[PDB]
Amino acid sequence: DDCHLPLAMIFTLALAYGAVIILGVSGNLALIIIILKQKEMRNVTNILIVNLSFSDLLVAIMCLPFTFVYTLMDHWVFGEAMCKLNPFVQCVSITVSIWSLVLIAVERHQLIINPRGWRPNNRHAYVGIAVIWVLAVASSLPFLIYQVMTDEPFQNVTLDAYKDKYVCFDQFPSDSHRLSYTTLLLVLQYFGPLCFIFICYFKIYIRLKRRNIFEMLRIDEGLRLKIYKDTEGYYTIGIGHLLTKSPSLNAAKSELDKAIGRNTNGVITKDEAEKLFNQDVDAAVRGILRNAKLKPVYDSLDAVRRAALINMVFQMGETGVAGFTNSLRMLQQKRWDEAAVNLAKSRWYNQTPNRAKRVITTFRTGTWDAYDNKYRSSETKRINIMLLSIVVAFAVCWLPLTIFNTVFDWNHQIIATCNHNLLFLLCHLTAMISTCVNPIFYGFLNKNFQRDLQFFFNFCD
Ligand SMILES: COC(=O)C1=C(C)NC(C)=C(C(=O)OC)C1c1cccc(NC(=O)NCCCN2CCC(c3cccc(OC)c3)CC2)c1
């Protein structure tokens, strides 16, 4: 066989695997214990995170050490029971994690669409996790059924006359049966769901940008649920939405019952106000793009700075903002500090300083730091970025082993060498690291958990 694996690699790997056990097993068990006993911190997202780290506890116990030890041997010393479970319990774990991450993305998407009235009773999450586990066990079953432990190796193993040497290998009906199962598993259970997860998180980001523009105008133009007479003298409702220039209150009430399409009687809801504000934002955007002066300036700006421009259109109008000739020129040319000086030298700034000072600070920094009251928008931005990073870390971790496994499923004829076993252990370890990314991203990036894990570890002493 001309084979020779060095002990300089073996011990370094044993240290690396042992580190991923003590960081994984403890971290995933700490994440569970904290969320479980800490009631009210056990929300739909957190319940699915406990389910996610429970599967990562199984692959760390049932699969991780047995695969490493078997690789360094020409025979399976753990029995038929541990042999058949190895690909099954690993597959179930990848699948449960995939669907639990899918469910988290759907829950986060429902929260960004409707945060006000979304009060979910955890029973739908318990229903989800049960369906996920039944779906995972079912789809993974052929690995358990077709994994074999026979003392009849395909290849020459080292002689041992006193004991019968057994080998743990996959023995599917045929190569087409194995390859067909494996390719739709990889496509429909790995790539497929992941694509959908990223689709949701993109849709979350897009709807969050439009709701950030809502919070900006709420603080400035003001959110009113009753038909009120504005500075001009005409009837308005919500965030500066004009009904009619008609002086009759009943004539103005008729426009609201037409805009909403419901018998309002002068009173509308918080959600009803956001729906019309978003329509005005689109109407303003359409106008800004129709405006030759304001179109190159809007196109130049980022999401935050475009909102500062929209806030200005909502206040002065299109002909109003167009009058800021030299200031818009500077904003177009990305001179944020120079433009902040010029926008303060206006008749707009002197008249409405409180609003202007905020709009100017947003045009200079390019962030919602001017509107510090909006800290609720800043928190869910951090949570969704962390949750997306968990998905990417999961996808990247398993990707080298997923490639190694398919490459050798199509090239099943190829004999396992010392170079293959080293490459496999480097892929297996990277995949095993996914067990650690769940508590490290939910600990060192989550503010609630980092202080809580320290007030539990030091409390034990
Ligand atoms: C829903 O997503 C999934 O279910 C999976 C993903 C995403 N990610 C991994 C790592 C999987 C896994 O661990 O599932 C249990 C399965 C999966 C995917 C594709 C393909 C496969 N193929 C097989 O298991 N073939 C059966 C043959 C497996 N052999 C791979 C090579 C290995 C080996 C080991 C040492 C040296 C070698 O050199 C030739 C070869 C021996 C076992 C699995």
Side-chain angles (χ1 to χ4, degrees), residues 87 90-91 143 170 182 185 189-190 402 404-406 408-409 416 420-421 424:
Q90 188 156 272
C91 192
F143 279 128
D170 61 292
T182 269
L185 213 71
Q189 281 261 33
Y190 182 65
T402 308
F404 192 89
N405 286 7
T406 62
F408 287 104
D409 266 0
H420 285 136
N421 293 308
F424 175 71

mmCIF file with all atom_site columns, all heavy atoms in Angstrom, residues 87 90-91 143 170 182 185 189-190 402 404-406 408-409 416 420-421 424, ligand 1:
data_model
loop_
_atom_site.group_PDB
_atom_site.id
_atom_site.type_symbol
_atom_site.label_atom_id
_atom_site.label_alt_id
_atom_site.label_comp_id
_atom_site.label_asym_id
_atom_site.label_entity_id
_atom_site.label_seq_id
_atom_site.pdbx_PDB_ins_code
_atom_site.Cartn_x
_atom_site.Cartn_y
_atom_site.Cartn_z
_atom_site.occupancy
_atom_site.B_iso_or_equiv
_atom_site.pdbx_formal_charge
_atom_site.auth_seq_id
_atom_site.auth_comp_id
_atom_site.auth_asym_id
_atom_site.auth_atom_id
_atom_site.pdbx_PDB_model_num
ATOM   1   N N   . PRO A 1 87  ? -23.715 7.459  9.495  1.00 0.00 ? 87  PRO A N   1
ATOM   2   C CA  . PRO A 1 87  ? -24.221 8.325  8.412  1.00 0.00 ? 87  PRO A CA  1
ATOM   3   C C   . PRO A 1 87  ? -25.644 8.846  8.649  1.00 0.00 ? 87  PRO A C   1
ATOM   4   O O   . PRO A 1 87  ? -25.962 9.958  8.225  1.00 0.00 ? 87  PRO A O   1
ATOM   5   C CB  . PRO A 1 87  ? -24.149 7.426  7.178  1.00 0.00 ? 87  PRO A CB  1
ATOM   6   C CG  . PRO A 1 87  ? -24.316 6.060  7.708  1.00 0.00 ? 87  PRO A CG  1
ATOM   7   C CD  . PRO A 1 87  ? -23.629 6.051  9.044  1.00 0.00 ? 87  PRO A CD  1
ATOM   8   N N   . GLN A 1 90  ? -25.740 11.727 11.391 1.00 0.00 ? 90  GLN A N   1
ATOM   9   C CA  . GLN A 1 90  ? -25.058 12.874 10.781 1.00 0.00 ? 90  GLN A CA  1
ATOM   10  C C   . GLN A 1 90  ? -26.015 13.554 9.784  1.00 0.00 ? 90  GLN A C   1
ATOM   11  O O   . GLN A 1 90  ? -26.160 14.775 9.825  1.00 0.00 ? 90  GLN A O   1
ATOM   12  C CB  . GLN A 1 90  ? -23.739 12.453 10.103 1.00 0.00 ? 90  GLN A CB  1
ATOM   13  C CG  . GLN A 1 90  ? -22.887 13.618 9.621  1.00 0.00 ? 90  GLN A CG  1
ATOM   14  C CD  . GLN A 1 90  ? -21.440 13.236 9.510  1.00 0.00 ? 90  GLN A CD  1
ATOM   15  O OE1 . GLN A 1 90  ? -20.678 13.332 10.471 1.00 0.00 ? 90  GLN A OE1 1
ATOM   16  N NE2 . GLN A 1 90  ? -21.025 12.794 8.335  1.00 0.00 ? 90  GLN A NE2 1
ATOM   17  N N   . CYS A 1 91  ? -26.695 12.755 8.931  1.00 0.00 ? 91  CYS A N   1
ATOM   18  C CA  . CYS A 1 91  ? -27.660 13.229 7.936  1.00 0.00 ? 91  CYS A CA  1
ATOM   19  C C   . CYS A 1 91  ? -28.857 13.933 8.592  1.00 0.00 ? 91  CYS A C   1
ATOM   20  O O   . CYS A 1 91  ? -29.211 15.035 8.168  1.00 0.00 ? 91  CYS A O   1
ATOM   21  C CB  . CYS A 1 91  ? -28.107 12.088 7.027  1.00 0.00 ? 91  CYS A CB  1
ATOM   22  S SG  . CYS A 1 91  ? -29.025 12.624 5.561  1.00 0.00 ? 91  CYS A SG  1
ATOM   23  N N   . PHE A 1 143 ? -29.668 5.763  4.643  1.00 0.00 ? 143 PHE A N   1
ATOM   24  C CA  . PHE A 1 143 ? -28.292 5.709  5.151  1.00 0.00 ? 143 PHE A CA  1
ATOM   25  C C   . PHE A 1 143 ? -28.184 4.662  6.264  1.00 0.00 ? 143 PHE A C   1
ATOM   26  O O   . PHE A 1 143 ? -27.252 3.863  6.253  1.00 0.00 ? 143 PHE A O   1
ATOM   27  C CB  . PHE A 1 143 ? -27.800 7.086  5.642  1.00 0.00 ? 143 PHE A CB  1
ATOM   28  C CG  . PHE A 1 143 ? -27.306 8.038  4.573  1.00 0.00 ? 143 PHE A CG  1
ATOM   29  C CD1 . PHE A 1 143 ? -27.804 9.332  4.488  1.00 0.00 ? 143 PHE A CD1 1
ATOM   30  C CD2 . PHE A 1 143 ? -26.289 7.666  3.699  1.00 0.00 ? 143 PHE A CD2 1
ATOM   31  C CE1 . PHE A 1 143 ? -27.323 10.224 3.523  1.00 0.00 ? 143 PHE A CE1 1
ATOM   32  C CE2 . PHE A 1 143 ? -25.817 8.555  2.728  1.00 0.00 ? 143 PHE A CE2 1
ATOM   33  C CZ  . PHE A 1 143 ? -26.329 9.832  2.653  1.00 0.00 ? 143 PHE A CZ  1
ATOM   34  N N   . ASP A 1 170 ? -20.870 1.833  3.198  1.00 0.00 ? 170 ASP A N   1
ATOM   35  C CA  . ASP A 1 170 ? -22.198 1.989  2.588  1.00 0.00 ? 170 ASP A CA  1
ATOM   36  C C   . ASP A 1 170 ? -22.423 0.915  1.511  1.00 0.00 ? 170 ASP A C   1
ATOM   37  O O   . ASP A 1 170 ? -21.579 0.735  0.632  1.00 0.00 ? 170 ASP A O   1
ATOM   38  C CB  . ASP A 1 170 ? -22.397 3.413  2.019  1.00 0.00 ? 170 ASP A CB  1
ATOM   39  C CG  . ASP A 1 170 ? -21.422 3.823  0.929  1.00 0.00 ? 170 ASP A CG  1
ATOM   40  O OD1 . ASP A 1 170 ? -20.220 3.997  1.238  1.00 0.00 ? 170 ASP A OD1 1
ATOM   41  O OD2 . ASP A 1 170 ? -21.866 3.996  -0.228 1.00 0.00 ? 170 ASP A OD2 1
ATOM   42  N N   . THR A 1 182 ? -28.401 10.548 -3.048 1.00 0.00 ? 182 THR A N   1
ATOM   43  C CA  . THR A 1 182 ? -27.392 11.537 -2.684 1.00 0.00 ? 182 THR A CA  1
ATOM   44  C C   . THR A 1 182 ? -27.536 12.869 -3.457 1.00 0.00 ? 182 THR A C   1
ATOM   45  O O   . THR A 1 182 ? -27.375 13.921 -2.845 1.00 0.00 ? 182 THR A O   1
ATOM   46  C CB  . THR A 1 182 ? -26.012 10.872 -2.840 1.00 0.00 ? 182 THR A CB  1
ATOM   47  O OG1 . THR A 1 182 ? -25.650 10.273 -1.594 1.00 0.00 ? 182 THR A OG1 1
ATOM   48  C CG2 . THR A 1 182 ? -24.915 11.812 -3.373 1.00 0.00 ? 182 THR A CG2 1
ATOM   49  N N   . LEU A 1 185 ? -30.719 14.601 -2.453 1.00 0.00 ? 185 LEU A N   1
ATOM   50  C CA  . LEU A 1 185 ? -30.508 14.974 -1.049 1.00 0.00 ? 185 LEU A CA  1
ATOM   51  C C   . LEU A 1 185 ? -29.731 16.284 -1.034 1.00 0.00 ? 185 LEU A C   1
ATOM   52  O O   . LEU A 1 185 ? -30.189 17.257 -0.449 1.00 0.00 ? 185 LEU A O   1
ATOM   53  C CB  . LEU A 1 185 ? -29.716 13.880 -0.311 1.00 0.00 ? 185 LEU A CB  1
ATOM   54  C CG  . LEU A 1 185 ? -30.042 13.664 1.156  1.00 0.00 ? 185 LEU A CG  1
ATOM   55  C CD1 . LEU A 1 185 ? -31.414 13.027 1.334  1.00 0.00 ? 185 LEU A CD1 1
ATOM   56  C CD2 . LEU A 1 185 ? -29.018 12.771 1.787  1.00 0.00 ? 185 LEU A CD2 1
ATOM   57  N N   . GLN A 1 189 ? -32.383 19.134 -0.309 1.00 0.00 ? 189 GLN A N   1
ATOM   58  C CA  . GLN A 1 189 ? -32.297 19.295 1.146  1.00 0.00 ? 189 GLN A CA  1
ATOM   59  C C   . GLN A 1 189 ? -31.135 20.192 1.603  1.00 0.00 ? 189 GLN A C   1
ATOM   60  O O   . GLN A 1 189 ? -31.125 20.623 2.761  1.00 0.00 ? 189 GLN A O   1
ATOM   61  C CB  . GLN A 1 189 ? -32.253 17.927 1.851  1.00 0.00 ? 189 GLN A CB  1
ATOM   62  C CG  . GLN A 1 189 ? -33.604 17.231 1.986  1.00 0.00 ? 189 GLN A CG  1
ATOM   63  C CD  . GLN A 1 189 ? -34.214 17.415 3.350  1.00 0.00 ? 189 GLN A CD  1
ATOM   64  O OE1 . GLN A 1 189 ? -34.046 18.457 3.998  1.00 0.00 ? 189 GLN A OE1 1
ATOM   65  N NE2 . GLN A 1 189 ? -34.956 16.410 3.806  1.00 0.00 ? 189 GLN A NE2 1
ATOM   66  N N   . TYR A 1 190 ? -30.172 20.489 0.705  1.00 0.00 ? 190 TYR A N   1
ATOM   67  C CA  . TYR A 1 190 ? -29.035 21.348 1.032  1.00 0.00 ? 190 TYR A CA  1
ATOM   68  C C   . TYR A 1 190 ? -29.079 22.643 0.248  1.00 0.00 ? 190 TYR A C   1
ATOM   69  O O   . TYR A 1 190 ? -29.403 23.656 0.845  1.00 0.00 ? 190 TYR A O   1
ATOM   70  C CB  . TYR A 1 190 ? -27.704 20.596 0.878  1.00 0.00 ? 190 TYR A CB  1
ATOM   71  C CG  . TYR A 1 190 ? -26.472 21.389 1.250  1.00 0.00 ? 190 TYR A CG  1
ATOM   72  C CD1 . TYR A 1 190 ? -26.252 21.801 2.563  1.00 0.00 ? 190 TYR A CD1 1
ATOM   73  C CD2 . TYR A 1 190 ? -25.469 21.625 0.318  1.00 0.00 ? 190 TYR A CD2 1
ATOM   74  C CE1 . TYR A 1 190 ? -25.091 22.476 2.924  1.00 0.00 ? 190 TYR A CE1 1
ATOM   75  C CE2 . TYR A 1 190 ? -24.302 22.300 0.667  1.00 0.00 ? 190 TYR A CE2 1
ATOM   76  C CZ  . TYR A 1 190 ? -24.121 22.731 1.970  1.00 0.00 ? 190 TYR A CZ  1
ATOM   77  O OH  . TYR A 1 190 ? -22.973 23.395 2.317  1.00 0.00 ? 190 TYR A OH  1
ATOM   78  N N   . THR A 1 402 ? -19.338 17.940 1.941  1.00 0.00 ? 402 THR A N   1
ATOM   79  C CA  . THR A 1 402 ? -20.397 17.706 0.949  1.00 0.00 ? 402 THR A CA  1
ATOM   80  C C   . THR A 1 402 ? -19.782 17.478 -0.443 1.00 0.00 ? 402 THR A C   1
ATOM   81  O O   . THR A 1 402 ? -20.249 16.602 -1.174 1.00 0.00 ? 402 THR A O   1
ATOM   82  C CB  . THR A 1 402 ? -21.446 18.826 1.000  1.00 0.00 ? 402 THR A CB  1
ATOM   83  O OG1 . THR A 1 402 ? -21.879 18.980 2.348  1.00 0.00 ? 402 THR A OG1 1
ATOM   84  C CG2 . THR A 1 402 ? -22.654 18.537 0.151  1.00 0.00 ? 402 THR A CG2 1
ATOM   85  N N   . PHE A 1 404 ? -16.455 16.516 -0.917 1.00 0.00 ? 404 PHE A N   1
ATOM   86  C CA  . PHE A 1 404 ? -15.685 15.278 -0.765 1.00 0.00 ? 404 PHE A CA  1
ATOM   87  C C   . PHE A 1 404 ? -16.573 14.045 -0.949 1.00 0.00 ? 404 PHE A C   1
ATOM   88  O O   . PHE A 1 404 ? -16.210 13.155 -1.713 1.00 0.00 ? 404 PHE A O   1
ATOM   89  C CB  . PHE A 1 404 ? -14.962 15.236 0.592  1.00 0.00 ? 404 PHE A CB  1
ATOM   90  C CG  . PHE A 1 404 ? -13.937 14.135 0.703  1.00 0.00 ? 404 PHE A CG  1
ATOM   91  C CD1 . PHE A 1 404 ? -12.623 14.346 0.308  1.00 0.00 ? 404 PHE A CD1 1
ATOM   92  C CD2 . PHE A 1 404 ? -14.282 12.888 1.207  1.00 0.00 ? 404 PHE A CD2 1
ATOM   93  C CE1 . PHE A 1 404 ? -11.672 13.326 0.417  1.00 0.00 ? 404 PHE A CE1 1
ATOM   94  C CE2 . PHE A 1 404 ? -13.336 11.866 1.293  1.00 0.00 ? 404 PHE A CE2 1
ATOM   95  C CZ  . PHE A 1 404 ? -12.038 12.091 0.897  1.00 0.00 ? 404 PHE A CZ  1
ATOM   96  N N   . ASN A 1 405 ? -17.753 14.025 -0.296 1.00 0.00 ? 405 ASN A N   1
ATOM   97  C CA  . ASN A 1 405 ? -18.706 12.921 -0.357 1.00 0.00 ? 405 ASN A CA  1
ATOM   98  C C   . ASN A 1 405 ? -19.300 12.705 -1.750 1.00 0.00 ? 405 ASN A C   1
ATOM   99  O O   . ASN A 1 405 ? -19.364 11.556 -2.171 1.00 0.00 ? 405 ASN A O   1
ATOM   100 C CB  . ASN A 1 405 ? -19.805 13.062 0.709  1.00 0.00 ? 405 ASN A CB  1
ATOM   101 C CG  . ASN A 1 405 ? -19.369 12.767 2.137  1.00 0.00 ? 405 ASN A CG  1
ATOM   102 O OD1 . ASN A 1 405 ? -18.193 12.567 2.440  1.00 0.00 ? 405 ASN A OD1 1
ATOM   103 N ND2 . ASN A 1 405 ? -20.316 12.739 3.062  1.00 0.00 ? 405 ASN A ND2 1
ATOM   104 N N   . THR A 1 406 ? -19.714 13.775 -2.474 1.00 0.00 ? 406 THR A N   1
ATOM   105 C CA  . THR A 1 406 ? -20.285 13.619 -3.828 1.00 0.00 ? 406 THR A CA  1
ATOM   106 C C   . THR A 1 406 ? -19.234 13.233 -4.840 1.00 0.00 ? 406 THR A C   1
ATOM   107 O O   . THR A 1 406 ? -19.487 12.351 -5.653 1.00 0.00 ? 406 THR A O   1
ATOM   108 C CB  . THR A 1 406 ? -21.070 14.840 -4.317 1.00 0.00 ? 406 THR A CB  1
ATOM   109 O OG1 . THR A 1 406 ? -20.203 15.967 -4.400 1.00 0.00 ? 406 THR A OG1 1
ATOM   110 C CG2 . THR A 1 406 ? -22.290 15.143 -3.479 1.00 0.00 ? 406 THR A CG2 1
ATOM   111 N N   . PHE A 1 408 ? -16.550 11.501 -4.427 1.00 0.00 ? 408 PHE A N   1
ATOM   112 C CA  . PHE A 1 408 ? -16.259 10.083 -4.212 1.00 0.00 ? 408 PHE A CA  1
ATOM   113 C C   . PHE A 1 408 ? -17.502 9.168  -4.324 1.00 0.00 ? 408 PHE A C   1
ATOM   114 O O   . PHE A 1 408 ? -17.371 7.950  -4.205 1.00 0.00 ? 408 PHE A O   1
ATOM   115 C CB  . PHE A 1 408 ? -15.488 9.878  -2.898 1.00 0.00 ? 408 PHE A CB  1
ATOM   116 C CG  . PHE A 1 408 ? -14.061 10.353 -3.055 1.00 0.00 ? 408 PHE A CG  1
ATOM   117 C CD1 . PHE A 1 408 ? -13.648 11.561 -2.504 1.00 0.00 ? 408 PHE A CD1 1
ATOM   118 C CD2 . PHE A 1 408 ? -13.150 9.634  -3.822 1.00 0.00 ? 408 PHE A CD2 1
ATOM   119 C CE1 . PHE A 1 408 ? -12.346 12.028 -2.699 1.00 0.00 ? 408 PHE A CE1 1
ATOM   120 C CE2 . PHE A 1 408 ? -11.849 10.101 -4.011 1.00 0.00 ? 408 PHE A CE2 1
ATOM   121 C CZ  . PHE A 1 408 ? -11.456 11.296 -3.449 1.00 0.00 ? 408 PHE A CZ  1
ATOM   122 N N   . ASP A 1 409 ? -18.682 9.744  -4.621 1.00 0.00 ? 409 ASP A N   1
ATOM   123 C CA  . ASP A 1 409 ? -19.902 8.975  -4.860 1.00 0.00 ? 409 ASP A CA  1
ATOM   124 C C   . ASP A 1 409 ? -20.006 8.710  -6.345 1.00 0.00 ? 409 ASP A C   1
ATOM   125 O O   . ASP A 1 409 ? -20.505 7.659  -6.747 1.00 0.00 ? 409 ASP A O   1
ATOM   126 C CB  . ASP A 1 409 ? -21.146 9.694  -4.335 1.00 0.00 ? 409 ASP A CB  1
ATOM   127 C CG  . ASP A 1 409 ? -21.533 9.284  -2.931 1.00 0.00 ? 409 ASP A CG  1
ATOM   128 O OD1 . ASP A 1 409 ? -20.834 8.426  -2.345 1.00 0.00 ? 409 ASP A OD1 1
ATOM   129 O OD2 . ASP A 1 409 ? -22.533 9.813  -2.419 1.00 0.00 ? 409 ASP A OD2 1
ATOM   130 N N   . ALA A 1 416 ? -9.117  4.493  -1.363 1.00 0.00 ? 416 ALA A N   1
ATOM   131 C CA  . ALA A 1 416 ? -8.739  5.433  -0.302 1.00 0.00 ? 416 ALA A CA  1
ATOM   132 C C   . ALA A 1 416 ? -7.253  5.324  0.075  1.00 0.00 ? 416 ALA A C   1
ATOM   133 O O   . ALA A 1 416 ? -6.809  4.275  0.552  1.00 0.00 ? 416 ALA A O   1
ATOM   134 C CB  . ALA A 1 416 ? -9.615  5.217  0.925  1.00 0.00 ? 416 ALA A CB  1
ATOM   135 N N   . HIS A 1 420 ? -5.954  10.834 0.757  1.00 0.00 ? 420 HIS A N   1
ATOM   136 C CA  . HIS A 1 420 ? -7.414  10.900 0.815  1.00 0.00 ? 420 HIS A CA  1
ATOM   137 C C   . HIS A 1 420 ? -7.881  11.009 2.253  1.00 0.00 ? 420 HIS A C   1
ATOM   138 O O   . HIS A 1 420 ? -8.712  11.862 2.545  1.00 0.00 ? 420 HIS A O   1
ATOM   139 C CB  . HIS A 1 420 ? -8.057  9.680  0.147  1.00 0.00 ? 420 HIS A CB  1
ATOM   140 C CG  . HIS A 1 420 ? -8.020  9.705  -1.346 1.00 0.00 ? 420 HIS A CG  1
ATOM   141 N ND1 . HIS A 1 420 ? -7.687  8.581  -2.073 1.00 0.00 ? 420 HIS A ND1 1
ATOM   142 C CD2 . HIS A 1 420 ? -8.281  10.719 -2.204 1.00 0.00 ? 420 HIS A CD2 1
ATOM   143 C CE1 . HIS A 1 420 ? -7.753  8.941  -3.343 1.00 0.00 ? 420 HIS A CE1 1
ATOM   144 N NE2 . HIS A 1 420 ? -8.104  10.219 -3.471 1.00 0.00 ? 420 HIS A NE2 1
ATOM   145 N N   . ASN A 1 421 ? -7.326  10.167 3.151  1.00 0.00 ? 421 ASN A N   1
ATOM   146 C CA  . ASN A 1 421 ? -7.648  10.151 4.580  1.00 0.00 ? 421 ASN A CA  1
ATOM   147 C C   . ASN A 1 421 ? -7.311  11.479 5.274  1.00 0.00 ? 421 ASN A C   1
ATOM   148 O O   . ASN A 1 421 ? -8.065  11.908 6.149  1.00 0.00 ? 421 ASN A O   1
ATOM   149 C CB  . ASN A 1 421 ? -6.978  8.968  5.283  1.00 0.00 ? 421 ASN A CB  1
ATOM   150 C CG  . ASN A 1 421 ? -7.508  7.615  4.862  1.00 0.00 ? 421 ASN A CG  1
ATOM   151 O OD1 . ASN A 1 421 ? -8.715  7.353  4.884  1.00 0.00 ? 421 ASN A OD1 1
ATOM   152 N ND2 . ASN A 1 421 ? -6.611  6.708  4.507  1.00 0.00 ? 421 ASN A ND2 1
ATOM   153 N N   . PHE A 1 424 ? -9.869  14.013 3.882  1.00 0.00 ? 424 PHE A N   1
ATOM   154 C CA  . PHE A 1 424 ? -11.145 13.677 4.517  1.00 0.00 ? 424 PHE A CA  1
ATOM   155 C C   . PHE A 1 424 ? -11.220 14.214 5.945  1.00 0.00 ? 424 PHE A C   1
ATOM   156 O O   . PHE A 1 424 ? -12.261 14.749 6.321  1.00 0.00 ? 424 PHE A O   1
ATOM   157 C CB  . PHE A 1 424 ? -11.419 12.161 4.487  1.00 0.00 ? 424 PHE A CB  1
ATOM   158 C CG  . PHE A 1 424 ? -12.669 11.727 5.220  1.00 0.00 ? 424 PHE A CG  1
ATOM   159 C CD1 . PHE A 1 424 ? -13.931 12.018 4.711  1.00 0.00 ? 424 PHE A CD1 1
ATOM   160 C CD2 . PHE A 1 424 ? -12.586 11.033 6.418  1.00 0.00 ? 424 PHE A CD2 1
ATOM   161 C CE1 . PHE A 1 424 ? -15.085 11.629 5.394  1.00 0.00 ? 424 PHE A CE1 1
ATOM   162 C CE2 . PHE A 1 424 ? -13.742 10.642 7.100  1.00 0.00 ? 424 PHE A CE2 1
ATOM   163 C CZ  . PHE A 1 424 ? -14.984 10.943 6.583  1.00 0.00 ? 424 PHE A CZ  1
HETATM 164 C C1  . LIG B 2 .   ? -29.160 17.305 3.344  1.00 0.00 ? 1   LIG B C1  1
HETATM 165 O O1  . LIG B 2 .   ? -27.766 17.202 3.153  1.00 0.00 ? 1   LIG B O1  1
HETATM 166 C C2  . LIG B 2 .   ? -27.063 16.013 3.319  1.00 0.00 ? 1   LIG B C2  1
HETATM 167 O O2  . LIG B 2 .   ? -27.758 15.047 3.645  1.00 0.00 ? 1   LIG B O2  1
HETATM 168 C C3  . LIG B 2 .   ? -25.572 15.956 3.148  1.00 0.00 ? 1   LIG B C3  1
HETATM 169 C C4  . LIG B 2 .   ? -24.768 17.089 3.122  1.00 0.00 ? 1   LIG B C4  1
HETATM 170 C C5  . LIG B 2 .   ? -25.204 18.482 2.864  1.00 0.00 ? 1   LIG B C5  1
HETATM 171 N N1  . LIG B 2 .   ? -23.443 16.997 3.600  1.00 0.00 ? 1   LIG B N1  1
HETATM 172 C C6  . LIG B 2 .   ? -22.847 15.774 3.979  1.00 0.00 ? 1   LIG B C6  1
HETATM 173 C C7  . LIG B 2 .   ? -21.473 15.964 4.519  1.00 0.00 ? 1   LIG B C7  1
HETATM 174 C C8  . LIG B 2 .   ? -23.643 14.646 4.047  1.00 0.00 ? 1   LIG B C8  1
HETATM 175 C C9  . LIG B 2 .   ? -23.408 13.533 5.007  1.00 0.00 ? 1   LIG B C9  1
HETATM 176 O O3  . LIG B 2 .   ? -22.505 13.453 5.835  1.00 0.00 ? 1   LIG B O3  1
HETATM 177 O O4  . LIG B 2 .   ? -24.384 12.539 4.926  1.00 0.00 ? 1   LIG B O4  1
HETATM 178 C C10 . LIG B 2 .   ? -24.347 11.388 5.747  1.00 0.00 ? 1   LIG B C10 1
HETATM 179 C C11 . LIG B 2 .   ? -24.939 14.585 3.267  1.00 0.00 ? 1   LIG B C11 1
HETATM 180 C C12 . LIG B 2 .   ? -24.491 14.116 1.869  1.00 0.00 ? 1   LIG B C12 1
HETATM 181 C C13 . LIG B 2 .   ? -24.494 14.987 0.753  1.00 0.00 ? 1   LIG B C13 1
HETATM 182 C C14 . LIG B 2 .   ? -23.926 14.584 -0.455 1.00 0.00 ? 1   LIG B C14 1
HETATM 183 C C15 . LIG B 2 .   ? -23.363 13.308 -0.585 1.00 0.00 ? 1   LIG B C15 1
HETATM 184 C C16 . LIG B 2 .   ? -23.380 12.403 0.504  1.00 0.00 ? 1   LIG B C16 1
HETATM 185 N N2  . LIG B 2 .   ? -22.893 11.112 0.200  1.00 0.00 ? 1   LIG B N2  1
HETATM 186 C C17 . LIG B 2 .   ? -22.695 9.983  1.025  1.00 0.00 ? 1   LIG B C17 1
HETATM 187 O O5  . LIG B 2 .   ? -22.818 9.967  2.260  1.00 0.00 ? 1   LIG B O5  1
HETATM 188 N N3  . LIG B 2 .   ? -22.236 8.877  0.300  1.00 0.00 ? 1   LIG B N3  1
HETATM 189 C C18 . LIG B 2 .   ? -21.921 7.578  0.899  1.00 0.00 ? 1   LIG B C18 1
HETATM 190 C C19 . LIG B 2 .   ? -20.387 7.397  0.908  1.00 0.00 ? 1   LIG B C19 1
HETATM 191 C C20 . LIG B 2 .   ? -19.717 8.280  1.976  1.00 0.00 ? 1   LIG B C20 1
HETATM 192 N N4  . LIG B 2 .   ? -18.240 8.142  1.847  1.00 0.00 ? 1   LIG B N4  1
HETATM 193 C C21 . LIG B 2 .   ? -17.605 9.479  1.516  1.00 0.00 ? 1   LIG B C21 1
HETATM 194 C C22 . LIG B 2 .   ? -16.069 9.326  1.327  1.00 0.00 ? 1   LIG B C22 1
HETATM 195 C C23 . LIG B 2 .   ? -15.445 8.649  2.588  1.00 0.00 ? 1   LIG B C23 1
HETATM 196 C C24 . LIG B 2 .   ? -13.946 8.500  2.514  1.00 0.00 ? 1   LIG B C24 1
HETATM 197 C C25 . LIG B 2 .   ? -13.185 8.484  3.719  1.00 0.00 ? 1   LIG B C25 1
HETATM 198 C C26 . LIG B 2 .   ? -11.783 8.388  3.680  1.00 0.00 ? 1   LIG B C26 1
HETATM 199 C C27 . LIG B 2 .   ? -11.112 8.321  2.441  1.00 0.00 ? 1   LIG B C27 1
HETATM 200 C C28 . LIG B 2 .   ? -11.867 8.347  1.241  1.00 0.00 ? 1   LIG B C28 1
HETATM 201 O O6  . LIG B 2 .   ? -11.138 8.393  0.054  1.00 0.00 ? 1   LIG B O6  1
HETATM 202 C C29 . LIG B 2 .   ? -11.690 7.746  -1.086 1.00 0.00 ? 1   LIG B C29 1
HETATM 203 C C30 . LIG B 2 .   ? -13.281 8.414  1.270  1.00 0.00 ? 1   LIG B C30 1
HETATM 204 C C31 . LIG B 2 .   ? -16.119 7.286  2.867  1.00 0.00 ? 1   LIG B C31 1
HETATM 205 C C32 . LIG B 2 .   ? -17.643 7.505  3.086  1.00 0.00 ? 1   LIG B C32 1
HETATM 206 C C33 . LIG B 2 .   ? -23.947 12.808 1.733  1.00 0.00 ? 1   LIG B C33 1
#
